[PDB]
Design a protein around this ligand. Structure first.
Ligand SMILES: *[C@@H]1O[C@H](CO)[C@@H](O[C@@H]2O[C@H](CO)[C@@H](O[C@@H]3O[C@H](CO[C@H]4O[C@H](CO[C@H]5O[C@H](CO)[C@@H](O)[C@H](O)[C@@H]5O)[C@@H](O)[C@H](O[C@H]5O[C@H](CO)[C@@H](O)[C@H](O)[C@@H]5O)[C@@H]4O)[C@@H](O)[C@H](O[C@H]4O[C@H](CO)[C@@H](O)[C@H](O)[C@@H]4O[C@H]4O[C@H](CO)[C@@H](O)[C@H](O)[C@@H]4O)[C@@H]3O)[C@H](O)[C@H]2NC(C)=O)[C@H](O)[C@H]1NC(C)=O
Ligand SMILES: CCCCCCCCCCCCCC(=O)O[C@H](COC(=O)CCCCCCCCCC)COP(=O)(O)OCC[N+](C)(C)C
Ligand SMILES: CCCCCCCCCCCCCC(=O)O[C@H](COC(=O)CCCCCCCCCC)COP(=O)(O)OCC[N+](C)(C)C
Ligand SMILES: CCCCCCCCCCCCCC(=O)O[C@H](COC(=O)CCCCCCCCCC)COP(=O)(O)OCC[N+](C)(C)C
Ligand SMILES: C[C@H]1CC[C@]2(OC1)O[C@H]1[C@H](O)[C@@H]3[C@H]4CC[C@@H]5C[C@H](O[C@H]6O[C@@H](CO)[C@H](O)[C@@H](O)[C@@H]6O)[C@@H](O)C[C@@]5(C)[C@@H]4CC[C@@]3(C)[C@@H]1[C@H]2C
Ligand SMILES: C[C@H]1CC[C@]2(OC1)O[C@H]1[C@H](O)[C@@H]3[C@H]4CC[C@@H]5C[C@H](O[C@H]6O[C@@H](CO)[C@H](O)[C@@H](O)[C@@H]6O)[C@@H](O)C[C@@]5(C)[C@@H]4CC[C@@]3(C)[C@@H]1[C@H]2C
Ligand SMILES: C[C@H]1CC[C@]2(OC1)O[C@H]1[C@H](O)[C@@H]3[C@H]4CC[C@@H]5C[C@H](O[C@H]6O[C@@H](CO)[C@H](O)[C@@H](O)[C@@H]6O)[C@@H](O)C[C@@]5(C)[C@@H]4CC[C@@]3(C)[C@@H]1[C@H]2C
Ligand SMILES: C[C@H]1CC[C@]2(OC1)O[C@H]1[C@H](O)[C@@H]3[C@H]4CC[C@@H]5C[C@H](O[C@H]6O[C@@H](CO)[C@H](O)[C@@H](O)[C@@H]6O)[C@@H](O)C[C@@]5(C)[C@@H]4CC[C@@]3(C)[C@@H]1[C@H]2C
Ligand SMILES: C[C@H]1CC[C@]2(OC1)O[C@H]1[C@H](O)[C@@H]3[C@H]4CC[C@@H]5C[C@H](O[C@H]6O[C@@H](CO)[C@H](O)[C@@H](O)[C@@H]6O)[C@@H](O)C[C@@]5(C)[C@@H]4CC[C@@]3(C)[C@@H]1[C@H]2C
Ligand SMILES: C[C@H]1CC[C@]2(OC1)O[C@H]1[C@H](O)[C@@H]3[C@H]4CC[C@@H]5C[C@H](O[C@H]6O[C@@H](CO)[C@H](O)[C@@H](O)[C@@H]6O)[C@@H](O)C[C@@]5(C)[C@@H]4CC[C@@]3(C)[C@@H]1[C@H]2C
Ligand SMILES: C[C@H]1CC[C@]2(OC1)O[C@H]1[C@H](O)[C@@H]3[C@H]4CC[C@@H]5C[C@H](O[C@H]6O[C@@H](CO)[C@H](O)[C@@H](O)[C@@H]6O)[C@@H](O)C[C@@]5(C)[C@@H]4CC[C@@]3(C)[C@@H]1[C@H]2C
Ligand SMILES: CC(C)=CCC/C(C)=C\CC/C(C)=C\CC/C(C)=C\CC/C(C)=C\CC[C@@H](C)CCOP(=O)(O)O
Ligand SMILES: [Mg+2]
Lengths: 656, 97, 110, 33, 95, 108, 76
């Protein structure tokens, strides 16, 4: 049998795209295959609870929703404090899957939403790259973005975070904008406006997006390639995007008042002026023409990206997070193995044949690369551009060398180059698979040791079933959503960090002596206190290595003038938990906690009894008594300790 | 005492029909709050009672609408719509001169 | 001192413009005038209902921009910059974008 | 269920086949009528 | 603080005025509706468009967004069909 | 600039940026240690300079070879050009792989 | 309160799942609880419970023992 050229071409494209989507979805689920399917890293538990609310209460009750189970002393309005796109997507998929009886719980939909959107991203990338050049580059870019390790790290099965869907939204908006620049039509600009609105609601990076379209338009102006198509497209996108972005509740009046959305307004005014001047330069003769010839500043989480010194030197709550440091070349290579070796070739092809849409992709690449160099968390937005460009690069080489072959209609150098390129591609596939398997898939609720000890879940379950219905527990901001999702009790601080005075209050309570801290706890009406210890299990990320950050945050706001972080070190400036430790550290409330009855438990073979694995030291105070606290519970490996705050002394005694 | 962390409101309870009932308006500040009664009198049993009450701020169906001070704006948009319609009847069906 | 050039340009504009384009320019002047009066009122009394001011104002700006884009696409001097955007398709896109904008403006005003 | 050592082998085989098929497509695209 | 009602009413009348100005300018040009011929597709299109705008007004007072979006979906589909037919006829007559 | 000077600036910028310059500035590392033995995200100045050099040289080899394909070129010089390109690319790739293996044990 | 749900399917097999709320009634606990004393002193903790065994009908094939919050890895 024989087939037409069109039939075989279509079959090849279809088969390649199907295999790429299946691989994208398949590669994402490694963690689900290992440990039981549960939402992890305790950032998405908030999103998960929110999604459940939207799935069992409706939208109108969700739009105006007041949560009294978090930040107890204050009030938290969840209906207008977060971008709602992810919850809406999950609830819509859930209702569609329930109309046709395919009944699936909300948790399974939340767990497997990110792989599905990662599968959609492949098709979107293919179409985007097809707009740039020959479809072959599109297939290559789709296949490469399928297996890229950074994107697979920030979106794994069981990780219900907003970045996953966000990337797909951003790529859709970029495709619509490229199609509007190439086509020059109002319809495509309106589609781009709607896509941009969706993107605004889904992620906090919409600001980023609205500072790349205007910059590109401005870059195009300088070059002199400005035409009516770009004017029409950008202006139509601007008006509708501004308005649609307004009505997201959390945003409010941010776009017209704030300073992150001023580049767009400036470029819009410049575009109007330029178009009118160009129109006036045609109706009048050259001699006549020559004769004629309260606002908010940068918020700060965006400013630190421009100036990478402010957040680390001034604000002790933004730099406290782990993945806020600059990225090294080793990390760059680990995330992308062969993509880095192809970025320059893609940039060269773009710079060699300048078009009206190439300039935009070049600008995207450059700016995104800088932002990836100034932060680890923004490596994500770098993976999508790279693939595209890398695809182009690789594709071009193939198309250059598969024409020199004699069989196609010295010559063997081209065959050698084809073999070399195939080797590069297969080794990139193997690298991506290994990096996905052995590094990126991991749970944060369970400590993998094969023996696993889930002390966190056990403590949360006890706290859920054996406390009064109104018991209030206070912990660090890290374990904020996790308690409410699993322990299901009223908490004091949370992982939002929108009121630094409250977190400073809790830090003061955790970093002072028992008298002052008991006063604080009585004032805030707290009942149980949950502190992670991890001294027996050897857990590096315990609630004692964060004590220094507690002190720094607490001794900052107008009441911790007596905290004086330089009072918890040794005379020479060390931080030891042994006898040589500071006499105020060994009497801190945090030290009385998570060391009660820990003085006489053997934890090693050739080591003294009162030994701490994580600090490799010997407790300074072996025996002490808690005057204001009872031990309510302690897990099996002493990983989580819950203490019940005591009452006032009945006979009115001191009880220091 | 109507208290959040420190008393926002503090009133007397008028004796009426065997019950101590007071009628008052909740403050502007939202959050969770606590009704509190404290009766410490010399020689009398100290009694203390606190009930917890959450105060929703507002709903989007309860904002004030049809403000007179915004009669201009409410008008303007509608005129625009009307304008568009007339355009869509004249721009299409017009005979050139 | 700069009135003769204005007289010349105004005279010329009329000759090189058809009926539909003159009609459209009249509509565009109406939009601009309504927006200017609204903004002047806002500068006179202030903004207590800020969202209503934004809604009513950007309705004017959006209708102005859609009118300008329709005018650009219709004018046959640019027939070489679109290549497939026929006048009827241009009017269709105008109606679609206008419906979206008016819906969002209504959903934003008080 | 499905052991990992199976999922990894499946992903490796699928990816290698995918890239080889994409390379083939480039040959087919260069030689058009 | 809020302005007196007299000022707001004055500005509302002033905002109504530009429409009158537009109409005067249009009759100065001489624009006519002579090409309209009462063809069924054109009449259906204009009726559906007017109904869509009236629905847009009604949504502001009573209907919520889901109901209004549903009604708009239906009316916009109808107006789209009528408009496709009418624009095809117009393109034929133009050439 | 004629779209070539800008490309040269972008190449220089890319090399320098992939050298972890921001890392060096924000967190001052000593020039040569004593490759971090167990810390993936760890950047000495010398190792980073060397690696970013490898990346840029690989891109240069690709463009240098890709250009070689142009017609009406003398064969004696084109053979040498092709040799340089193949050498640069293969060395860059194999080196970078070896470096990452040495820095992060257990690789693959 | 134990809820027993028995779903029958003519294609293959029948799957039974039961939710169990269970409570230790007598002699409620007063004072502090200490993991240390519980471990390093076998006397203390007499009235408490640690484990209990269920008997299944010898044809059970897919047992899972899930909680309301996730899997539980403590069973034999
Ligand atoms: C999601 O949740 C589910 C459900 O919770 C999780 O599944 C669970 O996973 C655990 C894994 O830890 C499984 O555990 C297994 O239980 C069996 C059964 O053991 C019982 O019977 C033994 C029988 O003993 C006989 O012989 C002795 C004399 O030797 C007699 O005295 C007896 O009377 C019997 O005749 C008995 O010995 C066991 O005793 C244990 O428990 C008591 C407490 O009651 C202790 O005091 C004892 O000291 C002892 O610990 C018990 O009563 C075990 O056989 C399994 O052991 C295998 O694995 C061990 C390591 O985990 C290993 O040490 C064993 O030697 C044994 O090894 C087998 O397999 C290896 C390969 O895997 C081989 O190399 C090896 O040769 C041998 O063949 C294990 O302990 C649960 O059954 C399982 N639950 C369910 C419902 O399926 C699931 O994991 C979760 N998912 C996650 C976490 O992702
Ligand atoms: C666009 C509009 C339509 C949208 C469609 C949305 C598609 C959603 C795809 C997700 C399907 C969920 C499947 C699933 O839940 O599997 C998981 C874990 O079990 C597994 O091993 C599954 C891992 C891989 C299965 C992936 C198949 C998904 C195919 C979808 C096309 C089960 O978790 P558990 O909660 O442990 O279920 C076990 C409970 N028993 C009592 C039954 C034992
Ligand atoms: C499949 C996944 C698609 C994801 C799309 C993402 C959408 C993000 C939603 C953001 C929510 C913003 C809140 C909002 O829009 O306001 C709601 C109006 O409530 C709504 O109508 C919500 C429906 C939003 C759908 C709008 C089209 C979105 C298309 C994006 C591709 C007010 O509803 P109402 O209570 O009806 O207010 C009208 C009252 N008036 C008297 C003023 C008329
Ligand atoms: C903190 C992060 C900051 C991010 C900064 C973003 C950097 C953007 C990277 C550069 C973008 C390249 C754009 C580009 O390709 O323009 C080139 C070369 O021509 C020029 O571009 C010269 C103008 C230089 C302006 C470059 C962008 C500046 C924008 C600042 C607002 C076009 O060359 P031309 O010669 O102008 O036009 C082609 C004519 N030929 C005959 C030569 C063919
Ligand atoms: C792609 C195919 C299948 C999907 C579909 O179009 C064609 O698009 C679906 C919509 O999402 C509709 C649901 C929205 C939520 C709404 C919740 C209410 O509660 C419930 O009463 C009705 C319900 C579930 C809607 C029913 C019809 C659905 C499933 C529509 C189908 C016909
Ligand atoms: C919930 C899921 C829904 C599906 C999806 O994920 C999320 O979300 C989809 C988007 O809507 C994408 C489409 C946008 C419109 C775009 C139009 C092009 O049509 C051209 O057709 C030519 C011949 O007539 C004309 O000449 C040209 O002018 C005209 O542009 C078409 O090629 C590509 C297409 C359809 C995009 C493909 C990928 C889609 C479907 C995305 C999926 C991944
Ligand atoms: C073209 C002009 C026409 C006149 C007007 O501007 C645009 O458009 C009117 C609206 O229809 C408004 C009414 C809606 C019903 C609403 C019922 C409430 O009950 C009542 O309190 C207020 C009321 C009557 C609104 C008052 C303002 C009106 C009349 C607006 C005018 C300013
Ligand atoms: C396509 C255009 C058609 C015209 C219009 O825009 C869209 O749609 C009109 C509505 O029908 C409004 C009237 C509703 C009844 C209401 C009765 C009260 O009694 C009276 O006070 C106000 C009144 C008449 C409303 C006034 C504004 C109207 C005419 C609106 C215009 C702006
Ligand atoms: C796509 C569109 C989006 C919207 C927009 O273009 C692009 O971008 C908007 C800007 O954000 C502009 C506002 C800035 C702040 C400025 C404060 C004034 O406050 C005055 O308050 C009086 C009370 O008495 C005093 O008398 C005065 O002195 C004092 O200046 C206010 O009147 C005007 C206001 C709000 C600007 C109006 C135009 C806006 C909305 C611009 C639009 C054109
Ligand atoms: C084809 C044209 C026909 C006329 C119109 O445009 C499209 O379609 C009308 C609707 O039927 C609207 C009425 C619905 C009932 C509603 C009852 C309320 O009670 C009352 O307050 C408002 C009222 C009467 C609506 C007013 C606007 C109307 C008349 C709309 C016009 C603008
Ligand atoms: C020619 C067109 C003109 C516009 C329209 O169609 C015909 O004529 C409107 C009617 O007035 C309808 C309302 C009646 C009262 C009914 C009260 C309920 O309470 C409410 O739930 C629904 C509501 C408001 C109806 C909704 C649809 C309306 C607005 C209809 C429009 C789509
Ligand atoms: C030059 C000049 C002055 C302006 C143009 C610069 C350009 C191109 C863009 C503006 C730069 C800027 C402020 C932010 C960059 C935005 C980026 C990279 C990512 C999104 C920002 C992060 C913090 C959101 C996630 O955080 P969360 O979701 O909230 O946790
Ligand atoms: Mg986040």
């Amino acid at each position: 049998l024989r087939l037409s050229y069109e039939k075989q071409d279509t079959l090849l494209k279809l088969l390649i795209l199907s295999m790429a989507a299946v691989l994208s979805f398949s590669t994402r689920l490694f963690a689900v295959l290992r440990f039981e399917s549960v939402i992890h890293e305790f950032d998405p538990y908030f999103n998960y609870r929110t999604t459940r609310f939207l799935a069992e209460e409706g939208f109108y009750k969700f739009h105006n929703w007041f949560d009294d189970r978090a930040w107890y002393p204050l009030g938290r309005i969840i209906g207008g404090t977060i971008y709602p796109g992810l919850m809406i997507t999950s609830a819509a998929i859930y209702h569609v899957l329930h109309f046709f009886h395919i009944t699936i719980d909300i948790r399974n939909v939340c767990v497997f939403l990110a792989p599905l959107f990662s599968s959609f991203t492949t098709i979107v990338t293919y179409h985007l790259t097809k707009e740039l050049k020959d479809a072959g580059a599109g297939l290559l870019a789709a296949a490469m973005i399928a297996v890229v390790p950074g994107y697979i790290s920030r979106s794994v099965a069981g990780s219900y975070d907003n970045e996953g869907i966000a990337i797909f939204c951003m790529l859709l908006t970029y495709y619509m904008w490229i199609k509007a620049v190439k086509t020059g039509s109002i319809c495509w600009a309106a589609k781009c406006a709607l896509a941009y609105f969706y993107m605004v609601s889904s992620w906090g990076g919409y600001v980023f997006l609205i500072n790349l379209i205007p910059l590109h338009v401005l870059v195009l102006m300088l070059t002199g390639r400005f035409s009516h198509r770009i004017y029409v497209a950008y202006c139509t996108v601007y008006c509708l995007g501004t308005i649609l972005s307004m009505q997201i509740s959390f945003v409010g009046f941010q776009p017209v008042l704030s300073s992150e959305h001023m580049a767009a307004f400036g470029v819009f005014g410049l575009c109007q002026i330029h178009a009118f001047v160009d129109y006036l330069r045609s109706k009048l003769n050259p001699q006549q023409f020559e004769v004629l010839f309260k606002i908010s500043p940068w918020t700060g989480r965006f400013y630190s990206l421009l100036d990478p010194s402010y957040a680390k030197n001034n604000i002790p709550i933004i730099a406290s997070v782990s993945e806020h440091q600059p990225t090294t070349w080793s990390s760059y290579y680990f995330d992308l193995q062969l993509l880095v070796f192809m970025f320059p070739v893609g940039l060269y092809y773009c710079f060699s044949n300048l078009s009206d849409a190439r300039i935009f992709i070049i600008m995207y690449g450059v700016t995104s690369m800088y932002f990836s160099a100034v932060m680890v968390r923004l490596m994500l937005v770098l993976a999508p551009v790279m693939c595209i460009l890398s695809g182009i690069g690789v594709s071009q080489v193939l198309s250059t060398y598969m024409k020199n072959l004699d069989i196609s209609r010295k010559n063997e150098v081209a065959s050698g180059m084809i073999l070399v390129m195939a080797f590069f591609l297969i080794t990139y596939t193997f690298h991506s698979t290994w990096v996905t398997s052995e590094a990126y898939s991991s749970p944060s609720i369970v400590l993998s040791a094969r023996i696993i000890f889930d002390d966190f879940r056990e403590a949360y379950y006890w706290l859920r079933h054996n406390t009064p219905e109104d018991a209030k527990v206070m912990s660090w901001w890290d374990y904020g959503y996790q308690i409410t999702a699993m322990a299901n009790r009223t908490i004091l601080v949370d992982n939002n960090t929108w009121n630094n005075t409250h977190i400073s209050r809790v830090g003061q309570a955790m970093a002072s002596t028992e008298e002052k801290a008991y006063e604080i706890m009585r004032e805030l009406d707290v009942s149980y206190v949950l502190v992670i210890f991890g001294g027996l299990t050897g857990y590096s990320s315990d609630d004692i290595n964060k004590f220094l950050w507690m002190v720094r945050i607490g001794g900052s706001t107008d009441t911790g003038k007596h905290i004086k972080e330089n009072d918890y070190y040794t005379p020479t400036g060390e931080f030891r938990v042994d006898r040589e430790g500071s006499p105020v550290l060994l009497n801190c409330l945090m030290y009385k906690m998570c060391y009660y009855r820990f003085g006489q438990v053997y934890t090693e073979a050739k080591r003294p009894p009162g030994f701490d694995r994580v600090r490799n030291a010997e407790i300074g105070n072996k025996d002490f008594e808690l005057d204001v606290l009872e031990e309510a519970y302690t897990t099996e490996h002493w990983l989580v300790r819950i203490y019940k705050v005591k009452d006032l002394d009945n006979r009115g005694l001191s009880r220091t | 005492e109507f208290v959040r962390i420190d008393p926002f409101v503090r009133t007397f309870l008028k004796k009426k029909g065997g019950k101590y009932s007071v009628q008052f308006k909740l403050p502007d500040v939202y959050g969770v709050f606590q009704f509190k009664v404290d009766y410490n009198r010399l020689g009398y049993t100290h009694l203390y009672s606190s009930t917890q009450v959450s105060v929703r701020p507002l709903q989007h169906t309860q904002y004030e609408r049809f403000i007179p001070s915004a009669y201009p704006y409410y008008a303007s948009a509608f005129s625009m719509m009307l304008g568009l319609f007339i355009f869509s009847i004249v721009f299409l069906h017009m005979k050139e001169k | 001192s700069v009135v003769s050039v204005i007289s010349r340009f105004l005279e010329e504009y009329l000759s090189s413009t058809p009926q539909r384009l003159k009609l459209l320019d009249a509509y565009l002047l109406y939009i601009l005038l309504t927006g200017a009066l609204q903004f002047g009122y806002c500068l006179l009394v202030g903004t207590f209902p800020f969202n209503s001011f934004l809604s009513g104002f950007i309705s004017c700006v959006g209708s102005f921009i859609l009118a300008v884009c329709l005018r650009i696409q219709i004018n046959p001097q640019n027939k070489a910059d679109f290549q497939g955007i026929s006048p009827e398709r241009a009017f269709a896109d105008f109606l679609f974008a206008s419906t979206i904008l008016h819906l969002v403006v209504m959903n934003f005003v008080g | 269920m499905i052991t990992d050592v199976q999922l990894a082998i499946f992903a490796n085989m699928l990816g290698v086949s995918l890239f080889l098929l994409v390379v083939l497509y480039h040959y087919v695209a260069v030689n058009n009528p | 603080k809020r302005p007196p009602t007299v000022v707001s009413n004055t500005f509302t009348a002033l905002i109504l005025s530009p429409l009158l100005l537009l109409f005067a300018l249009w009759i100065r040009i001489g624009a006519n509706v002579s090409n309209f011929t009462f063809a069924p597709s054109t009449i259906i299109f204009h009726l559906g468009h007017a109904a869509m705008l009236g629905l847009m007004y009604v949504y502001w007072t009573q209907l919520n967004m889901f109901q209004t979006l549903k009604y708009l979906a239906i009316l916009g589909s109808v107006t789209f069909l009528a408009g496709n037919r009418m624009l095809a006829q117009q393109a034929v007559k133009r050439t | 600039p004629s779209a070539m000077t800008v490309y040269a600036l972008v190449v220089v910028s890319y090399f320098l940026i992939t050298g972890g310059i921001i890392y060096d500035v924000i967190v001052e590392p000593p020039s040569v240690g004593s490759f971090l033995a167990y810390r993936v995200n760890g950047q000495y100045i010398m190792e980073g300079l060397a690696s970013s050099f490898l990346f840029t040289m690989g891109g240069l080899g690709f463009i240098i070879l890709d250009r070689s394909n142009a017609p009406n070129i003398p064969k004696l010089n084109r053979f040498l050009l092709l040799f340089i390109g193949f050498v640069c690319v293969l060395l860059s790739f194999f080196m970078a792989r070896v470096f990452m293996r040495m820095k992060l044990p257990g690789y693959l | 309160s134990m809820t027993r749900v028995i779903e029958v399917s003519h294609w293959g097999n029948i799957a039974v799942e039961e939710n169990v709320d269970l409570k230790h009634t007598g002699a409620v606990l007063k004072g502090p609880f200490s993991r240390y004393d519980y471990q390093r002193q076998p006397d203390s903790g007499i009235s408490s419970i640690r484990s209990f065994k269920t008997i299944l009908p010898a044809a059970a094939q897919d047992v899972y023992y899930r909680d309301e919050i996730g899997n539980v890895s403590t069973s034999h």
